[PDB]
Amino acid sequence: INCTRPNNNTRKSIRIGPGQAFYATGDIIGDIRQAHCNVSKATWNETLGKVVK
Amino acid sequence: IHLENVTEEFNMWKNNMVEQMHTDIISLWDQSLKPCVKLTPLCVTLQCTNVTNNITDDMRGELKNCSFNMTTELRDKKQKVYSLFYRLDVVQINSN
Amino acid sequence: QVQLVESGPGLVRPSETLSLTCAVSGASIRTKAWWSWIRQPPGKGLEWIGYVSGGWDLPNYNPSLKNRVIILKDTSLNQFSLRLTSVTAADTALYYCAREGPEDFDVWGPGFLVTVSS
Amino acid sequence: VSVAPGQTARITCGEESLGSRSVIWYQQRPGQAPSLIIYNNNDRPSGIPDRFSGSPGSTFGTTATLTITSVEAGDEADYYCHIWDSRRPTNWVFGEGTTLIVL
Amino acid sequence: QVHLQESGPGLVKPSETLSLTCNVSGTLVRDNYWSWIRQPLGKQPEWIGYVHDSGDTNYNPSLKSRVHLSLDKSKNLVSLRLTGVTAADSAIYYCATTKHGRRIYGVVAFKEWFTYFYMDVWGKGTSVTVSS
Ligand SMILES: *[C@@H]1O[C@H](CO)[C@@H](O[C@@H]2O[C@H](CO)[C@@H](O[C@@H]3O[C@H](CO[C@H]4O[C@H](CO)[C@@H](O)[C@H](O)[C@@H]4O)[C@@H](O)[C@H](O[C@H]4O[C@H](CO)[C@@H](O)[C@H](O)[C@@H]4O)[C@@H]3O)[C@H](O)[C@H]2NC(C)=O)[C@H](O)[C@H]1NC(C)=O
Ligand SMILES: *[C@@H]1O[C@H](CO)[C@@H](O[C@@H]2O[C@H](CO)[C@@H](O[C@@H]3O[C@H](CO)[C@@H](O)[C@H](O)[C@@H]3O)[C@H](O)[C@H]2NC(C)=O)[C@H](O)[C@H]1NC(C)=O
Ligand SMILES: *[C@@H]1O[C@H](CO)[C@@H](O[C@@H]2O[C@H](CO)[C@@H](O)[C@H](O)[C@H]2NC(C)=O)[C@H](O)[C@H]1NC(C)=O
Ligand SMILES: *[C@@H]1O[C@H](CO)[C@@H](O)[C@H](O)[C@H]1NC(C)=O
């Protein structure tokens, strides 16, 4: 299985207080896409055949 | 080391040590957070809009930009700062 | 999936202390097993030298080896070593590290010709 | 842009890139009709000459440029960019005029 | 081979319903997308929008109310209609064919792509001027 978030992220340090770091999300460098996973169709159909058997 | 001519009855469903593994992982997950920073001052009124994107009216923006007040290191001075969040982390408290 | 590989000389002088060392991967040394040394003079049949055990057995050799063979196991390095004090040129042989298990000597070493020559 | 004839010029237009862009480069003869030169990021159609190099629209945080090598007096045309960003909305007005003239 | 023939009044009264026609050469109005493009003098052009058979009639949301596009399959022309001509409408107008393209940047099945347009050919235009 392959899984990815393709949205590139930039973290940003915001100082909450003395020595308190919070990590927010900055810019989306690039396209705004949707995170997704992939599996091979044939191997998944074959393994479903195996578990059916 | 192998064992031969030996018949033991196993039972994974009433088994022990999976309860102990669950308890150990829970206690370890707790024990790796006590050093880290609590986010008590972050609970604050967020002015959120949609992210700058050519969004259709059907598919809502998954990412909402949110600007808010935040305390700095100095107690007297507060700053205005922005961030991004997902739809599954913000709710609409209740024009603006 | 066990893999045994010998190491050491293949050319030594007679009347000396010979010593090999076989490294073991693919499994553990402290198993139901006798990590053994077996030799073969060239063109001739096999000659079982002896063994050692990963448990607590005392090592038992062939009495024809004249009590000059001390096989010492190294569980901290997954190895076991042959010794042969006071060698002769007639002790030229292919040497083999192997593993007696529930089957008989499944994984051997490749076996290296120790040619004792002066 | 005013350069010597038979040279290479670089003409920039439009907003900086935010996402993936598909750019269209047009050119305009004075008093006459407009005309296309570049339709994809770096693709030109048939019936147009070569050496109209287009900037790749796969870069994030750059300006869409247009490179022309071996310029001429026939290249005296007001150039226009028309960007289509995957993040920005649809531009119903073109870019600002970038007039290329020659000595 | 294609070339277009723009036709309009040119002299328009203010607050009026403008109409324009666009004769074709060779390729009929059914086959292709069509577009209208306006440009004021010394200014960048303004894409008024595109029209096609079967509902593909997306206009500019700038005007969106006082402009209409249509075809003429019998006489094989392309027609513009406008409502309430004001002083900011004096320009040169163009009918023009256009071609689409799928710019694909991600998953196709997640609608992570968009159709851009580009006008390949043009016509003579019409110097539409509004004055009472
Ligand atoms: C899980 O499975 C899905 C498929 O079901 C994968 O999705 C693919 O993702 C890639 C990258 O996101 C997509 O690739 C893009 O393809 C566009 C179209 O490519 C077709 O058309 C061109 C031209 O006709 C052919 O050359 C090509 O072979 C294809 O036939 C391209 O236009 C894109 O390139 C653009 O961007 C790059 C960089 O941004 C620029 O350099 C280029 O100039 C160009 O502008 C891009 O390559 C692909 O289309 C997706 N497949 C489908 C079916 O949608 C997932 O990636 C996969 N996940 C994992 C983790 O493997
Ligand atoms: C961050 O902190 C600042 C500082 O308090 C906040 O700004 C203040 O917000 C209040 C609430 O809206 C404003 O009061 C209202 O202002 C409007 C516009 O002036 C006025 O019409 C109302 O009658 C009311 O007075 C206040 O003016 C405003 N102050 C400043 C300097 O902007 C701000 O809301 C906080 N959050 C963010 C996201 O910035
Ligand atoms: C998941 O991603 C991996 C990335 O490595 C893919 O593996 C490669 O696939 C290509 C395409 O067949 C091969 O040419 C490579 O040799 C593969 N590399 C390795 C290291 O395996 C894999 O195919 C992907 N699987 C799915 C289902 O998408
Ligand atoms: C799995 O493969 C078999 C053999 O080709 C096919 O008959 C079956 O329809 C496949 N299953 C699915 C869900 O496509």
mmCIF file of N, CA and C and ligand atoms in Angstrom, chain A residues 1-2 38-41, ligand 3:
data_model
loop_
_atom_site.group_PDB
_atom_site.id
_atom_site.type_symbol
_atom_site.label_atom_id
_atom_site.label_comp_id
_atom_site.label_asym_id
_atom_site.label_seq_id
_atom_site.Cartn_x
_atom_site.Cartn_y
_atom_site.Cartn_z
ATOM 1 N N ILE A 1 0.855 -1.177 0.000
ATOM 2 C CA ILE A 1 0.000 0.000 0.000
ATOM 3 C C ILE A 1 0.895 1.232 0.000
ATOM 4 N N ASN A 2 0.493 2.243 -0.762
ATOM 5 C CA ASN A 2 1.200 3.514 -0.818
ATOM 6 C C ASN A 2 0.278 4.600 -0.307
ATOM 7 N N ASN A 38 -3.099 4.148 -2.251
ATOM 8 C CA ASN A 38 -3.184 3.292 -3.421
ATOM 9 C C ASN A 38 -2.885 1.863 -3.032
ATOM 10 N N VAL A 39 -3.578 0.948 -3.693
ATOM 11 C CA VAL A 39 -3.290 -0.477 -3.612
ATOM 12 C C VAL A 39 -3.406 -1.053 -5.012
ATOM 13 N N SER A 40 -2.644 -2.103 -5.284
ATOM 14 C CA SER A 40 -2.724 -2.757 -6.580
ATOM 15 C C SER A 40 -4.054 -3.480 -6.727
ATOM 16 N N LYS A 41 -4.711 -3.268 -7.869
ATOM 17 C CA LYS A 41 -6.040 -3.822 -8.104
ATOM 18 C C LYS A 41 -6.004 -5.340 -8.196
HETATM 19 C C1 LIG F 3 3.991 1.914 -4.367
HETATM 20 O O1 LIG F 3 5.138 2.751 -4.508
HETATM 21 C C2 LIG F 3 6.350 2.041 -4.799
HETATM 22 C C3 LIG F 3 7.458 3.066 -4.807
HETATM 23 O O2 LIG F 3 8.733 2.445 -4.712
HETATM 24 C C4 LIG F 3 6.205 1.296 -6.125
HETATM 25 O O3 LIG F 3 7.366 0.501 -6.338
HETATM 26 C C5 LIG F 3 7.943 0.746 -7.639
HETATM 27 O O4 LIG F 3 6.991 0.545 -8.701
HETATM 28 C C6 LIG F 3 7.509 0.776 -10.021
HETATM 29 C C7 LIG F 3 6.361 0.570 -10.978
HETATM 30 O O5 LIG F 3 6.128 -0.812 -11.209
HETATM 31 C C8 LIG F 3 8.678 -0.168 -10.293
HETATM 32 O O6 LIG F 3 9.236 0.140 -11.565
HETATM 33 C C9 LIG F 3 9.739 -0.022 -9.209
HETATM 34 O O7 LIG F 3 10.766 -0.989 -9.403
HETATM 35 C C10 LIG F 3 9.125 -0.206 -7.824
HETATM 36 N N1 LIG F 3 10.128 -0.005 -6.791
HETATM 37 C C11 LIG F 3 10.170 -0.729 -5.668
HETATM 38 C C12 LIG F 3 11.272 -0.391 -4.711
HETATM 39 O O8 LIG F 3 9.353 -1.613 -5.434
HETATM 40 C C13 LIG F 3 4.976 0.394 -6.088
HETATM 41 O O9 LIG F 3 4.748 -0.177 -7.370
HETATM 42 C C14 LIG F 3 3.734 1.177 -5.673
HETATM 43 N N2 LIG F 3 2.593 0.287 -5.549
HETATM 44 C C15 LIG F 3 1.351 0.647 -5.882
HETATM 45 C C16 LIG F 3 0.294 -0.394 -5.691
HETATM 46 O O10 LIG F 3 1.095 1.765 -6.313
#
